[model samples]
Target: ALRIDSHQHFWRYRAADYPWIGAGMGVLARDYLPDALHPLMHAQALGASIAVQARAGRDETAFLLELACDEARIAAVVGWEDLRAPQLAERVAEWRGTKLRGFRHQLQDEADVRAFVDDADFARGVAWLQANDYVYDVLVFERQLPDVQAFCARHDAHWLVLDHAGKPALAEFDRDDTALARWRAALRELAALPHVVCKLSGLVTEADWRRGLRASDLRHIEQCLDAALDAFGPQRLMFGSDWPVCLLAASYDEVASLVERWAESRLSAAERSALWGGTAARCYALP
Candidate 1:
């Protein structure tokens, strides 16, 4: 078994380049590079990780490629491409040898989030990526599930992995909100698309980031996991520390153990191996 992390990141944040990393989140303010993440992977006995892009830019993608070049453990790179660019395919061609397994846009933060993939130009770009056998990592909010559902229907991800399970409502664990209901409903539709996958990443940040979670305090996380398993099943769901960011609510080991415990209760020891690594390798086409 490869034992790969489906999602995680390596970045040296700068206020100008990554305006998203504002002062409000102090812990995440400092630089996080491959060397920093290497030891954490060692702590958990993880061999490789998919380095997902934290910011949306061509330069950011190049930066990650550089890190992946240096760090052999970064087995794959989920980068950012200007999907809407007039010369989209050419730009993608330019990034050929960067271990670029997939691409993601921070659709959740865009001003015109819904219309992003709705527009023909953007949608066509996605189709181009699919035609080239490249995967798309869908990053969106729970409220935007309706749009994500529509987008996935129009453009097959070929192999799409929904980041953070479309970022479910962490503020409300009971999921009393209509958005959460719609998220669940939308998930059933997305799950019907066989090539589409869902990641167990970004949950810790979506949860109460202000407090550290204990073993007994992970009901909400487990509840979200139940929703994911019900929709994507054990074979489709994979572990992602969403490290550095996960550190906001839980340590790297804590997050890994949390999922290991949940996965242990329902799956055999060998079945747990797929949850930890196999699905990610299949989804990302990891070598």
Candidate 2:
């Protein structure tokens, strides 16, 4: 079977500017690209991947477009755009030639949550996506889940995929009941929207970072996965490595193995196929 990674990121942080990778996040201070990623993908049996934007500028989009022009393994490119830009639709049309599959904003980092979701300009930007047949990647952490749920609820026409299972609190393990409850409630609300998909990625790093994980350490994270699978079903759940971002916790092979181990008894053959690649191919409109 052909494996596809629906969510991952590639960037030359030095060549380009990543304002988000500021001080304090020690794990993500450098650059990551195909050369670093392809071998990992090979070992994990990933055939192709959809690359998501790592920064918040036009240069990020341009960089991915350029990469896609030469790299056939990059089946689709999900880059960033100033959703608040007035000529957003025109700009999207101009990039029609590139394999630009979708767009994203790091809304989790934005402080003004209400404006990010309900502002007139952002609404206009999302409308442009609806008109253009572009997918919208909703990247959020636990705190932004409520707003993300609202956004997904309001915009039923746009294709939105939740990155990192909406990024639950795997780091907290036993002591983070509040985070788990908030995430579960938010996911349940978001799942009501037929147009949204949830990505199964980045959970390993969210768990214990220093020591390797025991099966017991995975219970909370597994509960989140079970909730996602129950709410969205196989067709709406897709696989992603989160790549270099995953380097914070484990290698790509290890992450893939973790996912495989988690899904072994719970998922059917077809469901596992969908989660591994088929859902991503369909959601991202990958060729």
Candidate 3:
């Protein structure tokens, strides 16, 4: 079967200012590109991939777009933009001609969540993104889910992909019952938006990094799959590796294998096809 990684990242580690990737993130604090990712992708039978941005600037987006234009390995790119800018629509229109497939903001890392999403200027900028055909990738933690759900409901027409299953509190494992309940409830609300999709990636890293995880340890990941499959159905759910970032917990092959294993018994052949690549192809309008 043909495979496409809907969400992954590429960055010149030394050049880009990834403030989040601290010294503890050993393997990820280095450059990852087609040269490094191609062999692993081929090993896992991946045909193409959509490269998502890790940094916070337009330069990061520009870099990925240029890379996609030059490299056949990168099929699409989810770039970044300052959504708070007044000329956000014009900027998106200009980037539309490039290889940009979507857009994202690092809302999860932001200290003031309200200012990032609820602010008047940022909302206007997001409105501009919706006016164009660009997809807005909602990167948030469990705490920000209520706001995310509200935003999704308010901007129903804007294409939104909930990145990393909303970064649930998987590290505490079964101990975090309250977190799980709230996260699940928020997902239920967000799923009400027909245009929203969820990327099945990033759970491994969210778990205890040092400990070995069993299938049972992946409870939150399973919950996300169950909710997304039931709420949006298979067509609205897509696969993503979370790439070099996932290296903190597992290799690219391991990440791919986990997703494949999860879908084996749960999804039909057609649905698996959609999750692996078809839905992403249609969403991004990739060639």
Candidate 4:
């Protein structure tokens, strides 16, 4: 199979440019470009990848598109765009034949996720994306899963791929049973909507990053994967490294192995094929 890393990021890190890389996350404070990612992909036997945006801005999207132009292994790019921009139509139109296959808003940062979905300007931007055939990556936290469901319901036509399995409350899962159940219930409901897909990424960051993938970490991951496979199924799921951000917890190889090993144990060969690359290629209409 032609493996594709469905999600990862590249950035020229400046403290001013990435305030998200807070204290203690100093490992992500350096540049993470295609130069650093290419060999890692090759090591995993990955043929290509989708460079997702770490920050939302025109310049950020342009940077990834430029990288896609120069880096053949970057099969497509899921860049950022202010969905509220009045010039969104013009900007998206300009990218018609380019490598920009999708756009994402870091919805996890918004105080009220529903407000973002209901905003008229943002609604217009989403409409543009749907009309243009661009995928919309839904980035949100576990607590915001209900609102995410509503957002997906309202825009059922949009190709919404949920990043990080809604980023389950892994840090609290072992100590709290409700935490795991709540996330699973919400995720299952969201999966009922056929337009959505889930990415098996960012799990390590949501756990005890300082401890690495401990026994409890693996246990929590197993529960989350069981829920994801039950709800979205392999064809509606994809694998993503989350790259430099993942470096805060584990190495790129560890993150890839985490999911790869799970699929090896639980999924059939055809299912693995879908997760490894087919789903992403079909969802994004990648060449």
Model 1: per-residue lDDT, tens digit, 30-90?
Answer: 8998888888889888999999898878888898888887677998999998888889988
Q: Candidate 1: lDDT of 257?
A: 88
What is the per-residue lDDT of model 4 for residues 1-287, given as tens digits with 9 covering 90 to 100?
66899999999888988878887887888888898998899999989999998887888888989989867899999988878989888777766678999999999999989888888899888987887788999999999999867778877676899999999999998688799889999999989999999999899899988766687788789789889999998899898899878988888899898898899988999999998998988998888
lDDT of 3 by residue, 11-80 (tens): 8887349888875777777788878888988997889899998888888888898889877778888888
RMSD of 1: 1.8
Model 4: per-residue Cα lDDT at residue 80:
84
Which pairs clash in the backbone of model 3?
Answer: none
- Reference-based TM-score of each model: 0.94, 0.93, 0.93, 0.97
Rank by lDDT (best first)? 4, 1, 2, 3
Output the better candidate (1/3) by lDDT: 1
lDDT of 3 at 88: 75
lDDT string, candidate 2, 141-239, tens digits: 877888766677777776889888888887674786687777788888888789999999988767776676667656767887898988888789998
Candidate 3 ranges beyond 4 A from true positions? 93-96, 212-215
Cα-based lDDT for every prediction: 0.82, 0.82, 0.80, 0.88
Top TM-score hit? 4
lDDT of 3: 0.80
Task: At residue 64, give the lDDT of candidate 4.
Answer: 89
Which stretch of 10 consecutive residues in model 2 shows the poorest summed lDDT? 15-24
State each candidate's clash count: 0, 0, 0, 0
Off by over 4 Å in 4: none
**TM-score of candidate 2 versus the correct structure, residues matched by position:** 0.93
